[PDB]
UniProtKB/Swiss-Prot annotation:
It comes from Aquifex aeolicus (strain VF5). Disulfide bonds: none annotated. Residues 256-318 are annotated as: Linker L2. Residues 319-432 are annotated as: Mid domain. In the structure with dsRNA, the nucleic acid is not found in the expected channel, only the two 3'-terminal residues interact in a possibly physiological manner with the protein. Mg(2+) is the preferred cation for DNA-guided cleavage while Mn(2+) supports both DNA- and RNA-guided cleavage of an RNA target. Ca(2+), which is found in the structure, does not support cleavage. Cleavage probaby requires 2 divalent metal cations. The gene is ago. This is Protein argonaute.
Length: 690
């Protein structure tokens, strides 16, 4: 292994003295979705923390009423029949522990008492002035997880959200807004803005519907406003992130700036604090919460040896920088056409670009790739007219070449609400154009080593263009292919509308054998059956037959229906399958001084693992990911190790990458190809996304 690393996870336990709970079975059947509603109402009506088992509802206390009549939201009346009392013997799942634990936090108010005092004892400046018009909302969440071991773990994490004590309806009277993380007043969701329109435009019966389909005092009272008042209906704008009125939306802001919550050291000790109070508030009730953080079980070993088209491997030529200089690419597209876009402030002259270009073209010639230039496009600018001046070179003559190289200048700005920077801009615009791109910052050409950069690019470029410089010598375990898929669905009410699905198939050596990006407009909600289908269809049309081992990488979380479709077809094509979800959001965080923690892991219960897939060569707090084996006959250790190995296939060995080549830039593309009646039906064998 290496040197100790910590996780914001704390063993939690509930061994009360008074083990008596009152259970209540229903009269009819468990509407399940409503169950976790029915439990909440039981809490309120009963005033006792409660948790649900199958049908039974256990109340942390004595309740006398041989029947309870809780009234759900639908107004629906559910009757719970109080069965005898029970002697509590530990929770069964994490859900129980969590349900019951979150109640106490409420009946106790301890969390709010904290946010209360945090505000006072610190509002000393959680608010800033500035000349433009800033808060500091302290979001705090509690999760409960199990662990390979067997005990429960309280996942405590705190993050700060920054938004102006201003709203959107006010700003759309002063700028863009476009892609702006926003937040509805009485709602818990952060969306992005799309296109703001005038509210009058929607007649009147529009405001009727949604005004009833509201489940937020905010949304509701906000809709009613506009509905019973033609007066305002005109002067106010309706924003479409789902959609609400700009009068109940506050922009969530990202990182003049003299208010930073700083490094982890404190962060951990901050949660350490919050943990203490919690304890003090729930000790008298039988709750035991360990003061010691949880630590990585150990480091994982993965096959990390790559080789070129001649066999030269890194097991031998160990110096990666040297390797790249001697690698013999698995070239396939022998001649490349490329456009060169150049952004530069003032009427200057850049020999630096010319130097590099010549060195690149030549350095690639030495590898056997003639990089024939097609078009040069010089741009002068000093602001963000670049966006306004590049919005052309890009969506213009740039019509399929093999790559586009961009030399960017960086300007001192900051859009107070929207995220804008030529890097992200250029990149995203070329992603839609589905063209492989290499952004080279002029700041880098001026101060770095033209040689360490020449390499640094070459590797990126080669890959992006189907001339991968190397591939894995082998990966742990016998797998015939690694499939990575991401299905993203536009849901404007009801059950779906249309969707998009991106699939990438790599072989056993990590080579991208084929990708398939496609959208599915639909009638019935039978889009999964088809979507997943096309993947197997492509696996046979590729050369994989009965007996094949396929490891699949579901981007977000796997849905019951998708799992069945996989198992379903897998049966038809006779393929062996292992299913995996790879959660990249809201996971516990590692706290260490190791630096080389890549492979550091923590095993969770249901075959899940918390995996560090990258060396933290960036500040302090490391954000791992979660890997859960949904189905399959391979140890998670292997599946994890395979993921680590496949980290290498993003061909970026100087800038650490978190996700495996299989799901890297999926949500992004998938989330990105959801625009207009854009009908896409493309497959290729080039990792243009890199």
């Amino acid at each position: 292994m290496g040197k100790e690393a910590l996780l914001n996870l704390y063993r939690i336990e509930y061994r009360p003295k008074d083990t008596t709970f009152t259970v209540f079975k229903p009269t009819h059947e468990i509407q399940k979705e409503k169950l976790n509603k029915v439990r909440w109402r039981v809490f309120l009506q009963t005033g006792l923390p409660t948790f649900r088992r199958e049908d039974e509802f256990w109340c942390a206390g004595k309740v006398e009423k041989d029947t309870l009549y809780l009234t759900l939201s639908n107004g629906e009346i559910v009757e719970l029949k109080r069965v005898g009392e029970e002697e509590f013997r530990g929770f069964q799942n994490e859900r129980e522990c969590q349900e019951l634990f979150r109640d106490f936090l409420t009946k106790t108010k301890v969390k709010d008492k904290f946010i209360s005092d945090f505000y006072k004892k610190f509002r000393d400046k959680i608010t800033v002035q500035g000349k433009n018009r800033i808060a500091l909302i302290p979001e705090v969440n509690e999760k409960v997880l199990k662990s390979e071991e067997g005990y429960f773990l309280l996942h405590l994490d705190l993050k700060f959200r920054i938004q102006p004590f201003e709203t959107l309806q006010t700003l759309l009277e002063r700028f863009n807004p476009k892609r702006i993380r926003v937040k509805p007043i009485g709602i818990d969701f952060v969306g992005r803005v799309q296109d703001v329109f005038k509210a009058k435009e929607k007649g009147e019966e529009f405001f009727r519907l949604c005004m009833e389909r509201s489940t937020h005092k905010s949304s509701k009272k906000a809709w009613e406003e506009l509905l019973k008042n033609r007066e305002l209906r005109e002067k106010a704008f309706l924003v479409v992130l789902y959609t609400y009125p700009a009068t109940i939306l506050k922009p969530v802001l990202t990182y003049v700036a003299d208010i930073v919550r700083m490094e982890p050291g404190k962060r951990l000790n901050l949660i350490r604090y919050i943990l203490r109070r919690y304890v003090k508030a729930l000790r008298d009730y039988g709750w035991y919460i360990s003061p010691e953080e949880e630590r990585a079980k150990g480091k994982l070993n993965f096959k990390d040896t790559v080789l070129d088209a001649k066999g030269k491997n890194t097991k031998v030529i160990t110096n990666l920088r040297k390797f790249l200089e001697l690698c013999r690419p698995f070239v396939k597209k022998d001649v490349l056409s490329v456009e060169i876009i150049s952004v530069s402030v003032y009427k200057k002259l850049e020999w630096r670009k010319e130097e590099f270009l010549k060195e690149l073209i030549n350095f690639l010639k030495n590898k056997g790739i003639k990089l024939k230039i097609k078009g040069k496009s010089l741009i002068l600018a000093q602001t963000r007219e670049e966006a306004k001046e590049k919005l052309i070179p890009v969506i213009n003559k740039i019509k399929d070449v093999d790559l586009v190289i961009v030399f960017l200048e960086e300007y001192p700005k900051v859009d107070p609400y929207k995220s804008f920077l030529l890097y992200d801009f250029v990149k995203r615009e070329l992603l839609k154009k589905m063209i492989p791109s290499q952004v080279i910052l002029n700041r880098t050409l001026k101060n770095e080593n033209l040689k360490f950069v020449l390499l640094n690019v070459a590797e990126q470029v080669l890959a992006k263009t189907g001339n991968i410089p190397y591939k894995l010598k082998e990966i742990e375990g016998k797998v015939d292919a690694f499939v990575g898929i991401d299905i993203s669905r536009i849901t404007r009410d009801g059950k779906t509308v249309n969707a998009v699905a991106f699939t990438k198939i790599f072989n056993s050596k990590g080579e991208l054998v084929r990708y398939y990006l496609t959208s599915y407009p639909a009638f019935g909600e039978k889009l999964t059956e088809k979507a997943i289908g096309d993947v197997f269809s492509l696996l046979e049309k590729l050369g994989f037959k009965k007996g094949s081992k396929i490891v699949v990488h579901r981007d977000g979380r796997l849905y019951r229906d998708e799992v069945a479709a996989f198992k379903k077809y897998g049966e038809l094509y006779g393929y062996s399958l292992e299913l995996l979800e790879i959660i990249k959001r809201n996971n516990p965080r590692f706290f260490s001084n190791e630096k080389f923690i890549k492979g550091y892991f923590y095993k969770l219960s249901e075959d899940s693992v918390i995996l560090a897939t990258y060396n933290q060569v960036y500040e302090g707090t490391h954000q791992p990911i979660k890997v859960r084996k949904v189905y399959g006959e391979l140890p998670v250790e292997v599946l994890c190790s395979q993921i680590l190995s496949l980290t290498l296939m993003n061909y970026s060995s100087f800038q650490p990458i978190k996700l495996p080549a299989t799901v890297h830039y999926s949500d992004k593309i998938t989330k990105l190809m959801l625009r207009g009646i854009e009908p896409i039906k493309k497959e290729g064998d080039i990792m243009y996304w890199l």
